[PDB]
């Protein structure tokens, strides 16, 4: 759907590697989008819901775990965004590091609460899917351009 066009230029070749590096671009930034999305969307799920938890009221033991969490998401939600940022100025490693940072929000809030008796199934399985998606999101990063 492309070779239609490049073969017909003065210089196919050149036409080729352009139409196929734009356009290997283009998909990466849309991926990156989607997945950012798609994780940013559980975290706000997630740290709405950690907030009402903690607002029902739940044992000393889970609101601290419960509380470790919500600073976890907020600080995940930041970087998810920033690194959404960076992802639109090209710079796959600011980015890296953004999905990292958030990444490890995640895998603390997982680990300040897979321990407690009856936690929340949801906070649970948002914070693995966010984790899985963070990695999608940190490998594109990498296939970023870079000088």
């Known amino acids: 759907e492309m070779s239609t066009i490049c073969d017909k230029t003065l210089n196919p070749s ?19 989008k989607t997945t950012l999305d798609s994780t940013q969307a559980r975290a706000t799920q997630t740290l709405k819901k950690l907030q009402s ?12 775990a419960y509380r470790s969490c919500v600073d976890e998401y907020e ?11 960076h992802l ?12 990292s940072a958030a990444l490890d929000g995640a ?3 997982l680990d300040d609460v897979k321990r407690l008796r009856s936690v929340d199934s949801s906070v ?12 999608i999101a940190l490998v594109i ?3 970023l351009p870079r000088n």
């Open 75 to 85: 600080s995940a939600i930041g970087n998810l965004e920033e690194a959404f940022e």
């Open 107 to 109: 895998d603390t809030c």
């Open 53 to 64: 938890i903690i607002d029902g009221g739940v044992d000393p033991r889970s609101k601290l």
């Open 124 to 135: 649970v399985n948002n914070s693995k899917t966010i984790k899985n998606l963070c990695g």
């Open 141 to 143: 990063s990498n296939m």
């Open 14 to 32: 050149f036409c080729l590697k352009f139409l196929n590096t734009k356009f290997a671009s283009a998909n990466l930034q849309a991926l990156a």
């Open 88 to 99: 639109a100025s090209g710079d796959g490693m600011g980015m890296n590091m953004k999905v």
